[PDB]
DNA sequence: GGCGGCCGCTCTAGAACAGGATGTATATATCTGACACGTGCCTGGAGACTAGGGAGTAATCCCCTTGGCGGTTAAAACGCGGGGGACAG
């Protein structure tokens, strides 16, 4: 079991770091996530009178 | 001495309780009539073979629905007045 066990890890653990590697920085991103919106709706004129 | 208040007497009666009534639920006796087992086939699918063609998969592409916003006038919702109708009788 144990062999089997390390063996399944092993495997997962290649496509695991891949997803980890492009949502990890996506996790830290708060507000940058929203800024695609928050961009356009900050900025406008009527905000800035 | 007369009259209002109080309590006992008596008529009325609401509704639970017991007995009669009639159509079914059961307790055998026996018929009975299809039910399933056996037999004899015999007719339809399975092993095996020939050939092929429409989808799984891969790729493209372009398309089209979701997210995501201001805007503004149409309207949902809250509330006041009230009005006619569902239901109790």
Known sequence: KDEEWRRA???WNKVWRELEQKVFFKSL???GL???Q???KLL???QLI
């Open 9 to 11: 890890q092993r495997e």
């Open 29 to 31: 991103d708060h507000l």
């Open 34 to 36: 929203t800024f695609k």
């Open 38 to 40: 928050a961009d356009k």
């Open 44 to 46: 406008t004129t009527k």
